Amino acid sequence: MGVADLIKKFESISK
Amino acid sequence: MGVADLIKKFESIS
Amino acid sequence: MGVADLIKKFESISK
Amino acid sequence: TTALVCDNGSGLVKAGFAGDDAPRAVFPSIVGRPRHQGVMVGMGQKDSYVGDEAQSKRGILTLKYPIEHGIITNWDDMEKIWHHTFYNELRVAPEEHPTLLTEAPLNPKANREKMTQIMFETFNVPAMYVAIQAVLSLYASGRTTGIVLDSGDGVTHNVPIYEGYALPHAIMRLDLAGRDLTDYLMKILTERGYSFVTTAEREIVRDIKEKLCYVALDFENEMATAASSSSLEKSYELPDGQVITIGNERFRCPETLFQPSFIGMESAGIHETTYNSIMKCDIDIRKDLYANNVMSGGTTMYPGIADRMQKEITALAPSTMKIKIIAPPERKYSVWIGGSILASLSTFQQMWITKQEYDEAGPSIVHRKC
Amino acid sequence: TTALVCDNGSGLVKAGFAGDDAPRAVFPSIVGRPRHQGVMVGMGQKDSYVGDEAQSKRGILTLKYPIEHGIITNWDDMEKIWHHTFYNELRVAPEEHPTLLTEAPLNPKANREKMTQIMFETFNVPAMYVAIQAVLSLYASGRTTGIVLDSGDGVTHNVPIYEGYALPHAIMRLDLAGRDLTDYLMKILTERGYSFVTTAEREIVRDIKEKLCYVALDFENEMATAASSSSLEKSYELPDGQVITIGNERFRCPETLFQPSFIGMESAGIHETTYNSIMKCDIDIRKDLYANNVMSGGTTMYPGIADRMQKEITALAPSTMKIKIIAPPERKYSVWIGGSILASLSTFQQMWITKQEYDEAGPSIVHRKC
Amino acid sequence: TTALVCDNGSGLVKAGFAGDDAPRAVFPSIVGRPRHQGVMVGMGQKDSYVGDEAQSKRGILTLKYPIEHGIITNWDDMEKIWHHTFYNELRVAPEEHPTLLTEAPLNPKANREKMTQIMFETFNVPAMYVAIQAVLSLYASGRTTGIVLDSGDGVTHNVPIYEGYALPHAIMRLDLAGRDLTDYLMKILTERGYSFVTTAEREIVRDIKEKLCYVALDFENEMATAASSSSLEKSYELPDGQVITIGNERFRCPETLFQPSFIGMESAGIHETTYNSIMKCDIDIRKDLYANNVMSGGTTMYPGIADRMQKEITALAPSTMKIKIIAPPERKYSVWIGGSILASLSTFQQMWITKQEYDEAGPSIVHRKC
Amino acid sequence: TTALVCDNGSGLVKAGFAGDDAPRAVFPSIVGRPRHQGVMVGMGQKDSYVGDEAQSKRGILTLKYPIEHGIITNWDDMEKIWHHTFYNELRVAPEEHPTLLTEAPLNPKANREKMTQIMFETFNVPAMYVAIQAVLSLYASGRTTGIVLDSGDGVTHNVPIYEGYALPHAIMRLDLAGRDLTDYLMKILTERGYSFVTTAEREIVRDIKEKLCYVALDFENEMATAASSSSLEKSYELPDGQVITIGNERFRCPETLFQPSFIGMESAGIHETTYNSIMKCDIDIRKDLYANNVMSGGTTMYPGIADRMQKEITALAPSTMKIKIIAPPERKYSVWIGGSILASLSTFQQMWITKQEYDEAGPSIVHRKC
Amino acid sequence: TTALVCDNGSGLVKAGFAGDDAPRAVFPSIVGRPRHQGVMVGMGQKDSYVGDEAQSKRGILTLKYPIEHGIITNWDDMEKIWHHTFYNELRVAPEEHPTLLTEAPLNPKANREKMTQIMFETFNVPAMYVAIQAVLSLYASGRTTGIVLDSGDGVTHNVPIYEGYALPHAIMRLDLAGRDLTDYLMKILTERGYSFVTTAEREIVRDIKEKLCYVALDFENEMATAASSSSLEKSYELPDGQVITIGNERFRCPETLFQPSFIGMESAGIHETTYNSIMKCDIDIRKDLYANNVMSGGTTMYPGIADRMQKEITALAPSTMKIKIIAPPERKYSVWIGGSILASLSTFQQMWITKQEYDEAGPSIVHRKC
Ligand SMILES: Nc1ncnc2c1ncn2[C@@H]1O[C@H](COP(=O)(O)OP(=O)(O)O)[C@@H](O)[C@H]1O
Ligand SMILES: Nc1ncnc2c1ncn2[C@@H]1O[C@H](COP(=O)(O)OP(=O)(O)O)[C@@H](O)[C@H]1O
Ligand SMILES: Nc1ncnc2c1ncn2[C@@H]1O[C@H](COP(=O)(O)OP(=O)(O)O)[C@@H](O)[C@H]1O
Ligand SMILES: Nc1ncnc2c1ncn2[C@@H]1O[C@H](COP(=O)(O)OP(=O)(O)O)[C@@H](O)[C@H]1O
Ligand SMILES: Nc1ncnc2c1ncn2[C@@H]1O[C@H](COP(=O)(O)OP(=O)(O)O)[C@@H](O)[C@H]1O
Ligand SMILES: [Mg+2]
Ligand SMILES: [Mg+2]
Ligand SMILES: [Mg+2]
Ligand SMILES: [Mg+2]
Ligand SMILES: [Mg+2]
């Protein structure tokens, strides 16, 4: 629903 | 050009 | 009313 | 120099200058011819009296309308009217001003061309234009969406116009307007015991119609009422001094408009065409088209008619839809009121047909300028 | 006993016995209603005439068609027509003969049911049937591959058929036919100065469009010719005795078929549908389908139509592909010709709807025998 | 500054600012062309309207959709739509923001090119990108595993995605989408008696299908229910006033999506391709890939459709495997919800096609970056 | 009483008498199923056609191939084909003839059994025998030392054979024959703008990919070659009339065989198996086997593959062994040419399965005669 | 500072601290790299997963072992493996521990040398040492006299050892282990109808074989038994949802180890090597060695072989000498259990290879020390 943590900043999956 | 009684059963179905 | 008035009613809506 | 407009309906040709909010002259477009033996050198005996001047002296001359059902039957007589129009009611020079003319829709193409050729080769006016009476009438009401209904001196035409664009495949003509009612009113009065044959009577009947006739809000009741003892009777006095009383046959005259069977014509009344016209259009239009029924012309000046139309259209329309009839009391010149506007407006000033184009195209040019 | 076939279209109902090659009766399906007051007690001015004899006495009645655009509007009058057929043109007991009817595709199913119902419970015929008013036409030409265009006075519908199988997902239909052309030839006639408003007059115009019109093999070119001096003028004589001269508007009437914009309708001409119908079919079909355009219906009797249709298609069909219009001379009866051949067949007489079946499942049966 | 996402769907275009959670403007991507000859010289009639405004006045127009089945046919008017969605609908210059476009899978190469070229050189936008109208939709539900089914008014295409990787050898497609239903519901309406032919009317049907249809949870069962009288009758009101009563043919239109045997097409409905697409993937994928059928597109708003799908898959998929149709409530905008994220997303900002890199390579560069 | 060989190839069947060096009748093994409703009573339509006749009516039919990847998945249909082969394609009652059948290696056991059990019971043939669809290909070319490479609409496999001795631990297989090339081509054909979905069309792409594809002697160079405009653009004329221009995608489709990464399949292309299969054989053979490859089947008729192999293997095999690709220009029937020479062989009339033997063993006896 | 023991078995690398009695981390030594295109910007897909993680996402990558037949083919991947087990699966820097590695006997010297070099010049460990994959297994069972037999995915080698004294002139070897059984099973499995090609499926078989196979006790008697249907037919369920029924072909896939003639290898089954490799020893030993056959490795866990060996051997050796098979039910790690023991023995604490020693001798030093 247009949120940041992983919807607007898709989850920090660099590692 | 055509006739009154063009071929009846024409396709000859069995 | 009055045609002298309605002219503007169309003159303005003309553009 | 200003523009001229003479909405020459088949009856009282109205004419005036552009920009004015009222026509200048109004007069019965008739041509009088003396018939009886005239032997007196004193009288200023002319050969053809025109205009109300001719109307002022009926019993001595004859009457011949030059316009019959929206077309021009005889030309030379009609020619006098325009000539008498400019030089007596206006005293203005035709070539000194551009003019605008009117006409009903679906008119014979032969009428148009001659109306222009004469308008140039006998007056050399700068530019002449011919409008469709209904369209101008809308300009009068200031709207841009409605179904005109003009009728007077004998023509009847509904013309739907949604927005800017007019739908030519839904305009119905009708030869069932004021003239025949007058003729009918001359017939029905015979029952009561009166006589009217010569044209000089027709003017009387016309005036009698104009003030003692009203449209019944419901027909049979008025019949049932006036048949029994009632006060529908109204006394009128002829210009000689006699008096007549039209008891019942005072709403039977305009009722013809809603029942052509009274004369036998197969067509249906205006309360049936106006609906039967709309349904020719699309579906997304009929919403507001149902709500703008601007009337015009003389024949829409009857007292009761401002409502019998509203009641009727309701009877043959989807009930849940709303109806609003527009009826400006100054409608008797609406056909001409708009005429000023459609000529004073700025952008229109190019729509004209100067003499120049006529020279290089002849009368056939107007077919692409209507 | 033998089987009866009556292909009651929108104009002239056709009816005749099976096996024959020409229907017994042909007459305009109209229902006369006298309107004027009649005063003579001796002569039997009956209640309602019907048929050509009604057509004979135009000026006294109200010619009111019972069929409009394929569907049936008013029943009793229609019911008279069938009843006038069986007892005056054929004088045969309906209940003693199987009967077959025709009707255009894509029609309100409510029409079908109330047709077959009245066919049983008011005539008790042994077994009835309906059929696609286009398929029979294909049976006439003997082919089993082509695209019909039967467009007689009520509709215009193409029904492609590849090999005995129809293609119900590509069957266009157009509500535009002679019955509507007549109206257009009536409006455009007023351009000259004539007039026809009453239905009795309307029937006359239909009699003119028949023997005076022709389709321009090219429109803009031909129209420009008759605009200048030329001999495109003709001269028809009304039953009064006068004469009219339709100079240019003799090829502007049928042109409407290829440009419905003349009356506003958004759909395109038949030269579009016939093409824009084929493309809906598969790819391995279009080759021979492009080659057999059987035509039918009265509105395909115009002289120069058998060529305008070919030229138009080739203008938008791929070049290397070949088109060939098939237009038999007796197309005016093609439908009834076919239907005769249908009931004549032996493999087919099993398809009927036996009376007991209807009595078993009501009239809703026909929705599975189309 | 910020970025712009304008999903250029085939029906209602959708545009809005990147990063928000709802698109700004939505309006039927149609272009108007007035056809009826217009005579009102004062009014400022525009040449060709486009947008919801051109949708408001359906009366005098010729609604010509510029996008047929996810491809672009008419470029000019399409360009006009872009020119209208930028200035009049958003009042923001294009060259001030990088923009994102959407486009269906498996489209003609030429389409992508003549989209970018027009996007760059004619609007001087800084940078542009075009992604798949399926992958975008997955970002709506946030998942990185599932099989989209976005099918809005022009196409239908499942695109399996296991773990951020596509499977280009399984993308199906279908020209059996929303638009074609409107065509079907139009034909099936003739059954009752009503008839809509002009595109202005064809627009109305969309205002019925989308608010009176529902997917039968079991077709053959329910169709026998409403056969006998029941409460399946609804009564919609046209913008004219005459009401219609679609009794049965309200759950027979959307059924087409699960049975193209009605319009004649061969490829089975989506209740089969979806299962028949999954099986093209490997074995070890189908476990969870069976569990995420993220739907999208306007044609996924039918009430029942979210259930007949689930009731069908398990009816032909292995029983011991579980199915979970994740159908979000506001899927009508899912495609735009996606882009509004992917653009504002940080990492992706490297993939744009800058005017810099385009100007040395020409429009032939889109093929690699997408 | 002569023997009879009818290879049941997975694409178009091939049958003919034993001994003679040419197959009698070839026709695509398909089964017709009418899908559109049928309304023409007197038409001589059947319920399901089969054979090249059923190939001619691609429009109305629906083609369900009975063979898929070398297995049989539709028995009743397949049963008609043999029946349609014996009677209505050769007119030879099979009782008077012992027959020979073919089938690909590594075929599901349940298939081969049921083949016999039908071939005996419902036909009453004296003796039947099923060979390997590769061993027969050798005996065609006479040479008894080679590595066959079958292909074409179904399976693709190699079977090393040193001296009449197979090597069952080296037979490969692949579901990558022309069937998917005909299918993959119809995918990227969309890229240009065309499209084909209905199985009626899927038999047209085959008519393109037959006479318009060629395998590049070197892939990457050809791409950049035809990337810039050149003389690779060809044309083809559909059986409707509109033409297409497959410029580049005529050497990309036939090149899936050498890079199955295009349709996602993992196992490397045939340019690697044919080498990788060899290495599974003993050391003291390769030094000779490399010199004898015998391609065969419908897939290997391209102006390419017949050569590029000889170039490719050299990049893998050691540069000292000699590579020779036998490729007779009649290989398209090689599988049946050989099968003919084997039945007419003299020392072979013992290995047949006598109808007697099948009785006391049932169909299970086939598993000792292969 | 304890020691490190990470056996690099050709299948599941077993690694764990020294001294303990259970391997810490086991996982299939696989290396996978994605093969399909990637459309997911945010999703941080790595480049090359390794370990059971790469086993988990089985359906997108292409598992590709680095070890075949006890040798190392690719190194970089192998480098990742050790890099993964040190850092990820154990989180212990290498230089803090001496390390111990294993390797089958008779492996190409080039393999062993590189192993040390990478174990030193990349991880900088204190001391590395490689052992023999048999003598470790012996130490696990505590005995000091036996003939090992290890076989898991690759080698299969007996190594008789009398008393701490190997017999290098009797160490057999065979490349006939679980790998080919897993490979052969997916070849025989085709005959039933299923099929598995891509290396994704090649793990499924390895599972089905793992828990649905057992070595017969008398071959033919089993065949005739399972032929006439019985309770042999089991049923496994794939990770998709369908189920397969391996009726008979569940005791052939294990029955290769005793009959290499199924994949045509040159050698004989292990029920004969273990007899041969004993005979190659002296004659004063066998009379004891017949009583100690430690087994080991993966492929010694079928519910069969553990007791079929004790049967077959006696059919070869003289009767009076008695057979004794040792098969502890935890052997599947015994190769590493022993490896743990040898690390703790104080005696062994000098047999290492110090980092110092490697410097002044290079990798070549590992030969003399092992
Ligand atoms: N007071 C009135 N009541 C009813 N009808 C009238 C009245 N005055 C005039 N008329 C009718 O209206 C007509 C005048 O209409 P007119 O304006 O001349 O038509 P047009 O606009 O076409 O020239 C006359 O024929 C007359 O019959
Ligand atoms: N000679 C003719 N020229 C042009 N049109 C004709 C001619 N004769 C008849 N028609 C047209 O044929 C129509 C009659 O069609 P019809 O055969 O009744 O079709 P249907 O039987 O399907 O109603 C009439 O409307 C008329 O306009
Ligand atoms: N409320 C609704 N109920 C049912 N169907 C709808 C509704 N709204 C729209 N639709 C259907 O969805 C279509 C709109 O598709 P759309 O979502 O614009 O496709 P795209 O997103 O690809 O442009 C319309 O054609 C209509 O048939
Ligand atoms: N002239 C041709 N050019 C190219 N490919 C062809 C041609 N004719 C047939 N093919 C391919 O060969 C296939 C037929 O192979 P077929 O002989 O049926 O193999 P099999 O005999 O093993 O079944 C067709 O699917 C088609 O793709
Ligand atoms: N449940 C099981 N039963 C029998 N064998 C198995 C089972 N699970 C795995 N295996 C076999 O064990 C093998 C692994 O052996 P492994 O211990 O790696 O040998 P090494 O370590 O000496 O290389 C695999 O190839 C597999 O075929
Ligand atoms: Mg008047
Ligand atoms: Mg007819
Ligand atoms: Mg879309
Ligand atoms: Mg084959
Ligand atoms: Mg092991």
Numbering used by the authors:
A (entry chain M), C (entry chain N): 1 to 15
B (entry chain L): 1 to 14
D (entry chain I): 1489 to 1858
E (entry chain G): 1117 to 1486
F (entry chain E): 745 to 1114
G (entry chain C): 373 to 742
H (entry chain A): 1 to 370
What did the authors write?
The cytoskeleton protein actin can flux between globular (G‐actin) and filamentous (F‐actin) form, and this polymerization cycle is coupled to various cellular functions. The structure of actin is subdivided into four subdomains, SD 1–4, and contains a central pocket for ATP and magnesium ion. The presence and absence of γ‐phosphate at the nucleotide‐binding pocket induces conformational changes that leads to opening and closing of DNase‐binding loop (D‐loop), respectively (Kudryashov & Reisler, 2013; Merino et al, 2018; Chou & Pollard, 2019). Here, we describe the electron cryomicroscopy structures of phalloidin, lifeAct, and utrophin bound to F‐actin, providing a comprehensive high‐resolution structural comparison of widely used actin markers and their influence towards F‐actin.
